[PDB]
Amino acid sequence: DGPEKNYEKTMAILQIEAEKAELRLKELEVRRLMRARGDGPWYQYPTIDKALIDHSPKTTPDN
Amino acid sequence: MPLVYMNIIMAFAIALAGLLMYRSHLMSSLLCLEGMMLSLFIMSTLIILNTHFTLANMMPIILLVFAACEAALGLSLLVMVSNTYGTDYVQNLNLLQC
Amino acid sequence: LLDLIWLETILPKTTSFIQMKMSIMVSNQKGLIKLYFLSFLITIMISMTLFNYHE
Amino acid sequence: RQWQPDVEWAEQFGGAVMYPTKETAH
Amino acid sequence: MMSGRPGRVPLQFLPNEARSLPPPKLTDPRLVYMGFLGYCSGLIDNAIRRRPVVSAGLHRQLLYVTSFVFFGYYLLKRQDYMYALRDHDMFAYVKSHPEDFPEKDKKTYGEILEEFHPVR
Amino acid sequence: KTLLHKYSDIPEGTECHRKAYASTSIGGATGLIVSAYSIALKPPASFLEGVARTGRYTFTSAAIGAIFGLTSCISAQVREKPDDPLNYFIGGCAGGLTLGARTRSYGIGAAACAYMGLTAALVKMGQLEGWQVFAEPKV
Amino acid sequence: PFFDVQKRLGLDLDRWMTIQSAEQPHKIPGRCHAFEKEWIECAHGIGGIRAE
Amino acid sequence: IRWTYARSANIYPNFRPTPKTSLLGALFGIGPLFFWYYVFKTDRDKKEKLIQEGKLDQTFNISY
Amino acid sequence: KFYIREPPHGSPDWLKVGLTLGTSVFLWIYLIKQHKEDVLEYKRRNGLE
Amino acid sequence: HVTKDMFPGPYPKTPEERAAAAKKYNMRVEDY
Amino acid sequence: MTMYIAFILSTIFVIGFVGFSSKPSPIYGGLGLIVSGGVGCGIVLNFGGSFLGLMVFLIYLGGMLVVFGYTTAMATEMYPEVWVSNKTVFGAFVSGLMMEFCMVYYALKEEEVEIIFKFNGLGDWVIYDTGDSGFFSEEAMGIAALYSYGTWLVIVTGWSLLIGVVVIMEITRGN
Amino acid sequence: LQYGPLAFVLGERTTRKLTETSKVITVDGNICSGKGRLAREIAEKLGLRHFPEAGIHYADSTTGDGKPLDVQLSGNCSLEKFYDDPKSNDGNSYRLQSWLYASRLLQYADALEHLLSTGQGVVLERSIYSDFVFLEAMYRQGFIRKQCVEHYNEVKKVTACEYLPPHVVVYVDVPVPEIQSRIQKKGNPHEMKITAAYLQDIENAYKKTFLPEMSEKCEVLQYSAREAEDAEKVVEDIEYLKCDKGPWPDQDDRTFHRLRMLVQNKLEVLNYTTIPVYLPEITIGAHQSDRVFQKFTELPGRKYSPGYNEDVGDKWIWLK
Amino acid sequence: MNPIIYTTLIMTVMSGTMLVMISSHWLLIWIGFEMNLLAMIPVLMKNFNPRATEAATKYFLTQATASMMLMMAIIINLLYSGQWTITKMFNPVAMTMMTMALAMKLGLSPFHFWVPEVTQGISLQAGLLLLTWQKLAPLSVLCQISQSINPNLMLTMAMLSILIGGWGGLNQTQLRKIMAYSSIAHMGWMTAVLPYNTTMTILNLLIYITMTLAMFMLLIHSSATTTLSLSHTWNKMPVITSLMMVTLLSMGGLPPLSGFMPKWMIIQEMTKNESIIMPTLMAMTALLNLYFYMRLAYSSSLTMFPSTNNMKMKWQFEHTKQMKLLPTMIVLSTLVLPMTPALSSLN
Numbered sequence A: 001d002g003p004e005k006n007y008e009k010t011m012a013i014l015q016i017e018a019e020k021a022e023l024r025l026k027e028l029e030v031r032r033l034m035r036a037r038g039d040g041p042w043y044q045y046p047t048i049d050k051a052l053i054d055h056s057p058k059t060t061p062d063n
Numbered sequence B: 001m002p003l004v005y006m007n008i009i010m011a012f013a014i015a016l017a018g019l020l021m022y023r024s025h026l027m028s029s030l031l032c033l034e035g036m037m038l039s040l041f042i043m044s045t046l047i048i049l050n051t052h053f054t055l056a057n058m059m060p061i062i063l064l065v066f067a068a069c070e071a072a073l074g075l076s077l078l079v080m081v082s083n084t085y086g087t088d089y090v091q092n093l094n095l096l097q098c
Numbered sequence C: 001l002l003d004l005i006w007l008e009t010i011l012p013k014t015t016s017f018i019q020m021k022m023s024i025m026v027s028n029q030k031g032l033i034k035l036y037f038l039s040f041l042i043t044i045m046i047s048m049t050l051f052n053y054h055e
Numbered sequence D: 001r002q003w004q005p006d007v008e009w010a011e012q013f014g015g016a017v018m019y020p021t022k023e024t025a026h
Numbered sequence E: 001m002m003s004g005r006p007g008r009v010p011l012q013f014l015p016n017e018a019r020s021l022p023p024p025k026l027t028d029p030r031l032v033y034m035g036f037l038g039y040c041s042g043l044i045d046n047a048i049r050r051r052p053v054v055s056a057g058l059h060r061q062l063l064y065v066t067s068f069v070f071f072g073y074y075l076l077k078r079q080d081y082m083y084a085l086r087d088h089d090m091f092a093y094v095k096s097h098p099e100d101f102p103e104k105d106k107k108t109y110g111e112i113l114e115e116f117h118p119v120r
Numbered sequence F: 001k002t003l004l005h006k007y008s009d010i011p012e013g014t015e016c017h018r019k020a021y022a023s024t025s026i027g028g029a030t031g032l033i034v035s036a037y038s039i040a041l042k043p044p045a046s047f048l049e050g051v052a053r054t055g056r057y058t059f060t061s062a063a064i065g066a067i068f069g070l071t072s073c074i075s076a077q078v079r080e081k082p083d084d085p086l087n088y089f090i091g092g093c094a095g096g097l098t099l100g101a102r103t104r105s106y107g108i109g110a111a112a113c114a115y116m117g118l119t120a121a122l123v124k125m126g127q128l129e130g131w132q133v134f135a136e137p138k139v
Numbered sequence G: 001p002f003f004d005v006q007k008r009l010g011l012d013l014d015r016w017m018t019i020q021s022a023e024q025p026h027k028i029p030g031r032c033h034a035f036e037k038e039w040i041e042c043a044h045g046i047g048g049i050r051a052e
Numbered sequence H: 001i002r003w004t005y006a007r008s009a010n011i012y013p014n015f016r017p018t019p020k021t022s023l024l025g026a027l028f029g030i031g032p033l034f035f036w037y038y039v040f041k042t043d044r045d046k047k048e049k050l051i052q053e054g055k056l057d058q059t060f061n062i063s064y
Numbered sequence I: 001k002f003y004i005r006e007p008p009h010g011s012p013d014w015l016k017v018g019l020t021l022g023t024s025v026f027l028w029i030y031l032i033k034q035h036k037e038d039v040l041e042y043k044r045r046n047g048l049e
Numbered sequence J: 001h002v003t004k005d006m007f008p009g010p011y012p013k014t015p016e017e018r019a020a021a022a023k024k025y026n027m028r029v030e031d032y
Numbered sequence K: 001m002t003m004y005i006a007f008i009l010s011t012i013f014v015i016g017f018v019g020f021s022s023k024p025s026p027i028y029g030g031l032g033l034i035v036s037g038g039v040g041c042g043i044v045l046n047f048g049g050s051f052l053g054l055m056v057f058l059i060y061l062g063g064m065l066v067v068f069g070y071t072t073a074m075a076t077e078m079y080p081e082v083w084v085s086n087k088t089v090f091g092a093f094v095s096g097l098m099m100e101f102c103m104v105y106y107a108l109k110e111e112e113v114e115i116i117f118k119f120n121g122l123g124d125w126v127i128y129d130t131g132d133s134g135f136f137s138e139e140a141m142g143i144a145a146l147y148s149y150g151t152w153l154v155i156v157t158g159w160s161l162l163i164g165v166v167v168i169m170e171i172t173r174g175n
Numbered sequence L: 001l002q003y004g005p006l007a008f009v010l011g012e013r014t015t016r017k018l019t020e021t022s023k024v025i026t027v028d029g030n031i032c033s034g035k036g037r038l039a040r041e042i043a044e045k046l047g048l049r050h051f052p053e054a055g056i057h058y059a060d061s062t063t064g065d066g067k068p069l070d071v072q073l074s075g076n077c078s079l080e081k082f083y084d085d086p087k088s089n090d091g092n093s094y095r096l097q098s099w100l101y102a103s104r105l106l107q108y109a110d111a112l113e114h115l116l117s118t119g120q121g122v123v124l125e126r127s128i129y130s131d132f133v134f135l136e137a138m139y140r141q142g143f144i145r146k147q148c149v150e151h152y153n154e155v156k157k158v159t160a161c162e163y164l165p166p167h168v169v170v171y172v173d174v175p176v177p178e179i180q181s182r183i184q185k186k187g188n189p190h191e192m193k194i195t196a197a198y199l200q201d202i203e204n205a206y207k208k209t210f211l212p213e214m215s216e217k218c219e220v221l222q223y224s225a226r227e228a229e230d231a232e233k234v235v236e237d238i239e240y241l242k243c244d245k246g247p248w249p250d251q252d253d254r255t256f257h258r259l260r261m262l263v264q265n266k267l268e269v270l271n272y273t274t275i276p277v278y279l280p281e282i283t284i285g286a287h288q289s290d291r292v293f294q295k296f297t298e299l300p301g302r303k304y305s306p307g308y309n310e311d312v313g314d315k316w317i318w319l320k
Numbered sequence M: 001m002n003p004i005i006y007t008t009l010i011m012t013v014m015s016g017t018m019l020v021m022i023s024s025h026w027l028l029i030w031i032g033f034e035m036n037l038l039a040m041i042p043v044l045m046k047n048f049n050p051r052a053t054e055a056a057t058k059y060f061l062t063q064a065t066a067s068m069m070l071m072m073a074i075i076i077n078l079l080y081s082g083q084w085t086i087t088k089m090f091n092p093v094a095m096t097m098m099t100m101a102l103a104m105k106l107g108l109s110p111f112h113f114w115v116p117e118v119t120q121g122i123s124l125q126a127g128l129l130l131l132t133w134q135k136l137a138p139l140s141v142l143c144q145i146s147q148s149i150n151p152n153l154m155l156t157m158a159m160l161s162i163l164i165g166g167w168g169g170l171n172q173t174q175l176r177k178i179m180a181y182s183s184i185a186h187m188g189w190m191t192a193v194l195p196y197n198t199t200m201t202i203l204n205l206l207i208y209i210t211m212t213l214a215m216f217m218l219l220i221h222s223s224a225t226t227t228l229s230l231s232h233t234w235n236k237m238p239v240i241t242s243l244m245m246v247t248l249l250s251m252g253g254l255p256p257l258s259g260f261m262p263k264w265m266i267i268q269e270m271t272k273n274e275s276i277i278m279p280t281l282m283a284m285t286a287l288l289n290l291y292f293y294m295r296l297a298y299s300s301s302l303t304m305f306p307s308t309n310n311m312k313m314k315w316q317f318e319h320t321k322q323m324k325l326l327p328t329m330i331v332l333s334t335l336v337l338p339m340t341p342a343l344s345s346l347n
């Protein structure tokens, strides 16, 4: 076929690879960033739910 | 942390050493094993009683009834060893080797 | 001198000898728990304190 | 025909350990 | 790591909101390879039992392809879910953190001083 | 790692006696650990030869530790090049040669010369560049 | 847990006893009910890293 | 077949590291390699020196 | 014929095999409809149709 | 065919295997 | 004295543990262990754990260790290995009487004992909490919750015990 | 179905079927002593399953049509050949004995399998526990090299330990001059040349070894030729024991379920027979073994699993 | 042992491991470990040989000690925090305490000394259960508490696991001891990545599960326990030896076989975590496993070892086993590398 096919097709190949390349570099940075700060959706290590708290009055006022 | 807690913790550690530092009677080894849990049973009671973790008064029995279960296994293996070999020695309990 | 003696001894045979020399002594165990549990006691003792793993 | 293992090769792989010694001799 | 994200209901193989993604097309190349695995099990299945491999128990290996394809298909949707999920909250984060992602300056190669090493 | 910290605190090619003392302490402790293991897994039938076994192992490991202590430090002192990895390489080979002397075999000494000297260079390579073996969880 | 079946089907198996400020028999308190209740509600919906 | 065996396989099993074997191996080994390294290094250390200060001529040298 | 006894798989286990076709056609007809229902629901959810 | 022991071996130190090695090269010991 | 009474009970607990941990005769090791078993109950009793303290007497002193005596009566190595029989056991027993004597003195002088953990050598009585328990014994109400909230533990503990009896006869059946 | 674990769970036991006609009686004796004749009479008069003496092709009898396969394809040994040159360099002697031991060991399993699955007693000639009398005999004159004993024993403990001993053993006591009497009337030229020493050396090993050490775990009744022909006398003697010694009057359904597991798996029962200890008589090199295996494989029926060979007429291969 | 009794014993062992993975309370975690232990011994006792009794005794002593030592880690964490929830614990000594307590159950460090010997004594089927299913429970705790681990302490334990586990493997004749040494080596690979990212710690688990099911049930089908005994299997069933060499190569990690997928991803992760010396050394020691892997492959099918005339009976008969799930096991254990990006499903 014409060289136009290979030229345009390879341009798409470069476009796809570039976006993939920069995303991985972003992914390693974000993964490092949100692991440390922790204010992110994932890496949210488990805690204890506040629902399991007995708010009923106890037998001792000092509670 | 209160001085007594050392006494149980050190009791476990020296009980732990006796369990690992062997001799010639794995019967004696089992004694260190059940003594090992006795300190665990004893110490667990102190924190739970001290901190008034009322529902946690559970586990001293739960830990007991399961540590006691290992005695059933361990002592049963004792007589099994003391039947194919007759005795409870540990140096002779090396038939595996290779 | 080189192809059949030295070049086969420096890289290949030396590594093969070292692996075999230290494959035997790892596998040469006694089968007696007294020594194995003694090794564990060392491992617990050194790991807890000596290499500052706790702190 | 191509060489095939014989009792020499087999006994090389037979025993307690293919890398033996005096300690493992018995 | 998505181990504790907000909303993850446990023991949910395919969460409902994953349905908002393009489902894997029925002849997805990944899927047919999953079907390959089912077939490849079938040929050897007659081999261990010493049967006429290819022409031996057409029912047996036919089920293998069916089972592997479906278990593959649901796996692919779940696999596509996390990658979509991993990219989704990714993007939501960077807009929420502009200061940690500066826009690097736009300089053409003309002004960039890249030293040159001859090969001699 | 305070005992290991002693070696790092002393600047390279400076206060050679301190570096030798720090280095031989590392070797002595390392020899003690392996000797205690060898006593454990391999029974020292009689107690006295048990102290002989751990004596040999500690004496060796101290010798490699000590000899590497001087040769590394004095070479940096003599050549006024602390950053040079070769400083450890000669010391590494020097330590390996001492192992051959303790085992009385040129072949083992030659083998220890190459391997330990190469590793001695590599650890210095890491210290200069910043290589971390037990890296903390980063991502 | 590794597989939080308890959360999925909502049957309480052990978490009734995992902390001391939960429901207790005869509604009698632990030694540090006031403090751990404060810490628990401080560290809810926050994450282990941030709550540290 | 004895000759082929003695010249192909029966060398290393009969080999023993000795100063004669060791020195000859080193002499015929690293020796020539480092010797050529020094020769090529100094030659290249003179070549780039000449062109760097413009003391060499490659007016018609293009297809390098 | 050759083996003097009827070997266990020497006869077609009709109940078992007929099951195998039964599940596989179930396994398939579930898949196509599952693929179908996933498609337009995704289209409807994401706008489209 | 040559099975194993006509294949060459290690140096013959003492004259016993020197004689065996000489026979291995089908020659006498005075010239081996 | 009664100032540091729980200091005492903890001390015999340690020396009782050093007893059997020194690997003496299994009956003698049992004797040393039950001595620790006896004294340990007093430690729990001093904290109000009467029900827990009485149990170890029941199922650990009169429980496990009784059937231990059977295996000792079954083992019966050809000679008693009582403390005088061996010299390492004396060394083990003698040693185990030193460091705990060392650190109590270490803890009694400046109280800043930092073995593994930081530890205070202050009087045992301090860490007690002040407050009435009304009419409900806190220990009793805690254990009685076995059948109120400890439903899940009851099933698993029971099921394992049932599996406990199936294994024991199966291993001991000797095929 | 078989005795698979589902069967035992659903209720398939073993003690229900077996009755007083459940014994592992073995009729045995010296060469050509008419033991096989007496074994048949016991079988007929007791309604008790008979097993003829396991030959080289007994395994061939079990598999396929039962037609004896080629000696090259099954046995690599001939008893007639062993008669011609007992000390042949090819190892025909030990190869004969070891294959014979495997054949009777398979026969022992077939007897137990039928007995446990039917409750009917089994009578067989020369049980595997008595097989040593030949190897002992073949060792006394050097028909086999000394090392053959240890290998034959090594197989024996790793196999015969699990197979428990019979109930009552019938012995046809026959003296050597009598053995030297009939074998002329047999006529086959290979068995004329049997040495009187061999007939002697089986006899004492039979007498001083086989009968006494094995007697403590089953009843032993000795019959000479006259009490061998008296089928009426021997059969009521067999019925007139309590059969107390031996493991058989002690086990329960648990062991029998496990016992029928091992015996039903025809690969397992002789799995330890192919022991990897190498000796010249029994070891076959790779080239010879491979070529024979191809020759075995290209045979009809054996190309695939049973019920899976289209050549013999296995229809519906695509559906089985 | 009665099949109904055997089924129940396995049922509790599975549930005990299941109990560990589903408990948010530290006490229940211990309950699962002990009752799994409580039913593991009788399975090893099914054969009831003196070697098995030695094996079972060894297994119980180390596992009971590790489990009992595990209690203090819970108690000490309780003492300093008053939290029974299985989360990031709050004491370096307690964190250190349990790490070797769980490691002994897995057998990575010198703790690993029980792993080979117990496998040697007990039957092939029991070894399959011990080396595959009994490794999920200790791993489950480590995955949950991975955020609290000291990186130096765990990486070391992983290192000696692959280091010693691979090194001694060169000197094993019995296939059972070879498998255990392989298991210890594979133990290090998952444990090394454990502090960094737990996702491919699991990925290594199911994959490592696949070969060990594949290898052991192949070995059971072969009914062989020694290298020489395995060698003779070429004559009986040459095809099985062919698949085993595929798995042997795959378990060694040569691409594009499945066993390369874990190691490749493991190297990728710690490389992202700036740890680049650590992955390199494990890869170098990976060839150590490959050596005796090749030696078995050389003895099994690549060459053709001598057979015995008594093998001729085996030709006539056939196998009665059903080797359930064997067909799909090896296929899933040898060619799944193209389906690698499916690991995000684990996440």
Ligand SMILES: CCCCCCCCCCCCCCCCCC(=O)OC[C@H](COP(=O)(O)OCCN)OC(=O)CCCCCCCCCCCCCCCCC
Pocket: F004, F007, F023, F024, F026, F027, F030, F031, F034, F056, F057, F060, F061, F064, F065, F068, F069, F103
């Ligand atoms: C920059 C700071 C540091 C500066 C100082 C330099 C480092 C410290 C000193 C050198 C340490 C490494 C050299 C080896 C020391 C141990 C030697 C030893 O154990 O020798 C005894 C023995 C060898 O002899 P053997 O095979 O037993 O034969 C005789 C048998 N009768 O041993 C054996 O048999 C077992 C095999 C050897 C022991 C195992 C390996 C030990 C070394 C591991 C690495 C240590 C690294 C230390 C430094 C970094 C960490 C602090």
Ligand SMILES: CCCCCCCCCCCCCCCCCC(=O)OC[C@H](COP(=O)(O)OCCN)OC(=O)CCCCCCCCCCCCCCCCC
Pocket: E043, E047, E051, E052, E053, E054, L303, M237, M238, M239, M240, M241, M242, M245, M246, M301, M302
């Ligand atoms: C990644 C790299 C490669 C990794 C794997 C490598 C594996 C082999 C490596 C070497 C192994 C050791 C040396 C060789 C061992 C041979 C083992 C063996 O048993 O060989 C003999 C045996 C005899 O064959 P037999 O079992 O009788 O079966 C014949 C077919 N019925 O032979 C056999 O049992 C083999 C039977 C093979 C049957 C093949 C059937 C193919 C069917 C193809 C169907 C194609 C359909 C295409 C459809 C297109 C349209 C969609």
Ligand SMILES: Nc1nc2c(ncn2[C@@H]2O[C@H](COP(=O)(O)OP(=O)(O)OP(=O)(O)O)[C@@H](O)[C@H]2O)c(=O)[nH]1
Pocket: L030, L031, L032, L033, L034, L035, L036, L037, L053, L079, L096, L097, L100, L101, L104, L125, L126, L131, L134, L135
């Ligand atoms: N090595 C060996 N040879 C056997 C065995 N059983 C039979 N033979 C041989 O088989 C040949 C003939 O079988 P015998 O049973 O001795 O004699 P027979 O003429 O068949 O008559 P019966 O003794 O009544 O069966 C003799 O050469 C025996 O030595 C056996 O278990 N091992």
